[PDB]
Fold this protein.
Amino acid sequence: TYKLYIMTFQNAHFGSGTLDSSKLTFSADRIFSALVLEALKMGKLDAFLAEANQDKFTLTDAFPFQFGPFLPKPIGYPQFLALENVDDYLNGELFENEEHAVIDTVTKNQPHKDDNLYQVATTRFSNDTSLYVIANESDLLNELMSSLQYSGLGGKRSSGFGRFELDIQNIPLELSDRLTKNHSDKVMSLTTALPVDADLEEAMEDGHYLLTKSSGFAFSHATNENYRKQDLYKFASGSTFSKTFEGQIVDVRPLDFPHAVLNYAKPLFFKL
Amino acid sequence: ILTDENYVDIAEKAILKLERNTRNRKNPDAFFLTTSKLRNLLSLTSTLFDESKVKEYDALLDRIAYLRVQFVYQAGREIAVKDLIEKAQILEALKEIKDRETLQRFCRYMEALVAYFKFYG
Amino acid sequence: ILTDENYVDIAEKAILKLERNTRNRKNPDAFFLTTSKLRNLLSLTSTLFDESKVKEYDALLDRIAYLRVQFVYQAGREIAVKDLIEKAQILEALKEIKDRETLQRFCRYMEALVAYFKFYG
Amino acid sequence: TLSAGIGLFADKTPISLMAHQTGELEEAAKGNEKDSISLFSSDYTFKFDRFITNVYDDKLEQIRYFFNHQDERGKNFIYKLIELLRNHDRMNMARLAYYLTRLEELTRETDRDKFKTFKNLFYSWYTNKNDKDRKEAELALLLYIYEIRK
Amino acid sequence: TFAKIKFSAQIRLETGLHIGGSDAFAAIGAINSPVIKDPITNLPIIPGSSLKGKMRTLLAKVYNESDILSRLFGNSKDKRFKMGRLIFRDAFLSNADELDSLGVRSYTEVKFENTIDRITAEANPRQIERAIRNSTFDFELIYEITDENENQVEEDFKVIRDGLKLLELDYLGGSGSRGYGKVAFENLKATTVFGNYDVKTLNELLT
Amino acid sequence: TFAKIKFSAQIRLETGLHIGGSDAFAAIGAINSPVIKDPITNLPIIPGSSLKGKMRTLLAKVYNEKVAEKPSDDSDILSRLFGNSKDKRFKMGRLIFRDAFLSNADELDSLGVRSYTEVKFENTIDRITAEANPRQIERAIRNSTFDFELIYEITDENENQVEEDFKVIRDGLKLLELDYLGGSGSRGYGKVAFENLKATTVFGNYDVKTLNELLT
Amino acid sequence: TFAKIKFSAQIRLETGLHIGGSDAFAAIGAINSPVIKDPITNLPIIPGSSLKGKMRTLLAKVYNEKVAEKPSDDSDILSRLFGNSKDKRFKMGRLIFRDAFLSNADELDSLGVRSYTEVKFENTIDRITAEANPRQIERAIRNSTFDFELIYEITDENENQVEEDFKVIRDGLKLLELDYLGGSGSRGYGKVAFENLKATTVFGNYDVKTLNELLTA
């Protein structure tokens, strides 16, 4: 709400459902699960969840940062837009997407083995592009993300991916004025949110979203076996709505599991 | 003068503007310049083009210096090598070489003169 | 003193600063110095340049000590050389040797004199 | 009219890797005015007009007519022609002039005139100022070396 | 407590690195087998997976029959040891300006190779691209102190340095049984970042 | 157990080395066969690939029970020391050749030597017609020395094969001294001499003083 | 089996030879046909390339039934000793010609020698107008002698051809003595003797007793 972070990667894998395909942003439950796995170690996640369950805790997925903050294309009412261009895009002439990251793909190996060729895609950022989560300024979050500097984000992360440099900044105005979370007019979820149920019936009627399917494993220390998550369909970073809704933190534990698998989907919005 | 631009296009233009046997109409239009007199100068610039790729430029100063001597001496013997080094501004391009990237430009310029000498007759 | 960056220009300036036929203006500007006598001067150094290449300076110092005397004796006989060993600083720059690469540079200076003498005349 | 991308691949390289490095070539083929048959690499993207009429039936047919009625110049000559076509500064025009003229006097003098017409063809379309004939000659000699490989 | 202590080296090339490539096209007179590069920089890269697996196969010959490889490089099974506390990073060719000040045209070279048949004695040439000699790359390696680590911290440092004395004896790269590797770790130090730890005795140990 | 020992020696030469690099289309009067040279120092290398290939093909004549079509068909004595692509036991086989990098530029400059590579001028004479066709080929000069080093790894039970591997490796160095390493070969260009053959163990615990005597 | 045996000899020059040489940066008066020399001791060399090259073409008048017109048209006795490129079996063939190096440079100081080469003036005279055309060409001096190694491979493909090839080797060495080994040759400049023809095995086990009786005989 109050303080945009800055992640400067220069090497990152961000998943997309495979290893052969990566994506240049990372869909806010990834950064929230990174913080949960960073507060599970240095054991602190009870404080981070008593903070996180509050309505003070907002969090927001990454958008590019090339000399200024970007926002998604709002889906409907005629790919990213700088904040200077969003009002001109709601008139809409041409805002063709420049290069933020080049998505390379490299074949790798496990030498002297039998089915050993895997292929890792990689967003290689173009020497100025950063990714900027927007979250509420809090010291616990700063101790968490200043060590996610050195643990990394997203992909392989122990083979040298997703490792950044955090450069916490104030939010520039005309982007702080339009983060609302309780509005009643033409609004845009710049997170990937999942509404509460009756609130979701309120959400579907004139919401212009994508769906995008957050899924596809639980990272644990208590199974010695990899169990699939509960395959959560969500909304997109575009996803215009009317009458701003209220999201969840959807427990997607693979049933009969020792702990919770949280999958942050509650929205910070953008007025338009 | 010759830059990293037209220095080869100079050399071709020097060869067509070089005197011929208007006489001797048994395979005519041939130069007075014999190609051995010109390969004996390409031999010098070829050893310098090879050593410039390896050694420094301060370690080629005496060697480069001797180049002018030979292009003078070969010009004082035959009149054909004399108008070779006059039509192709070789004594002037020799005074201009001060860096290894300019030494190699002169050393490739002489190869262009030999290449177009064989290409025409 | 002659250095590796100036000796050819010193040699050109020495061959130009050299007397000519004042009378006998049928084909004028001919020197009072002949090609045979200057090649006689270069013959003294041609059989030291090869041994400057091959073997050590401490067997050639004796032959340079007699090279001083050879230039003295050639200067004394004809007055044509006598006004070339002074114009070109030959006896001055012969005492300046002290190693291999100045012996070689002096022999190249003599060749530069012969080269500019063929080039002018 | 249509725009193709042809990729050459070795034995048993996987079709997931093979159908993607060819989508790159046919989006580079859509990366000019209307259409192109982007051959083997990300360059070599010839328009279809300055292809079949101009490479596949003009230049490669003259290359094939030279090196099949002739005995002494082999794959070493074609390799050096491809190298001079791939580097190509103005100094390589001088080196190519010297090279072709120097090999012209190294044929059997019954094979000198066939070589001389081929020399004039290659030197004409190496220095042709259109800039297209060099690229077309390079791909045409690529094709002729890919035919005659044992 | 919690810490993340990073290691640091300029990793110098004593012969030429060949690493990698996805086999684009042969291009009849051009480089067969080009070296891996950076898409933005077009400079050679030592990727972090290539360092990580190489020094965990070097430690699978010393520290094998294991728990100590498993907790330093993860294990897909074995619920404790997933992302085992070592966070590699790609290496990024620091001294590019020095390579243009020593004087060189490209940062990679083409080595010409061949293969002579045992029967025919017919050659078969290759043009392998190498990342040229005396280049330094930036190597950093995050080791991650937690409480379960604080049981067993120091014997994970007699492995890491032991895992860096072996890349200096094996080759780190492609066809390095015949030259082509020979990497070195000049200016090898350690420091602590996010947390708080004492790396005085560690930095005396890294000699 | 595990160990890495290092064979260091000094490749002196006589009838100096042509070992070719780029046969790219050279200049008009210049060297036709340039020797392989380092990118920074512009000095010769005797690379590891040439040493390894020569020493296979010379030990393939000696230690093969049967003549091989290819390195895949080599004997296990050589397949374990030089690797084999096809045998599962012998992928990554026990020896690391390293490039050799001209130890004595300063000693050669102390001698009267201008360039570390010479260009020897050479020709072919046609048999009818007796035309001559010349050649300028580069040649790393005569008494240069080069830092040769091998690394031999000692794994699980390779320990019974250690001694009779080094009898092989020594023997391979005795065959390079009778053969030539590199280009043009049967016309001079070859003679090498391995000097100060010292085996030092680098990693692990092996007793090389019972072994360093074998290489004198 | 595998063996390598080594023909040693000592090349003695007579009217010593001129294997033509390098330098373009020479002079205006001095040696303009330089000889090939060691880059480090500056002593003259007989390179093994010229030895093999004269030896093939002097053995090829004798051992070719059909005329050559090229190497790789030689008659499978010279293809196996000197290599073809175009026989599958005769590419690396069986003979290594090392470069000969000047051996008796200390002996040629007990004789009054200033320098191990000589410079010789040679003068094309024109036959009309009688004008002269001098040159100074270098050559190694007369009693110079040279180490000569020549290495021979004996595999199983040398089944019974070792004696037949050593006939050819000692035929080529006595045929170089009737000819000149590089240089002017028709003007002197050539005459080479081979002394101390001695063959020893350097690798493998082979009998050199019966080999040194078509060498020295």
Q: What stands out?
A: The longest strand of chain D covers residues 37-38.
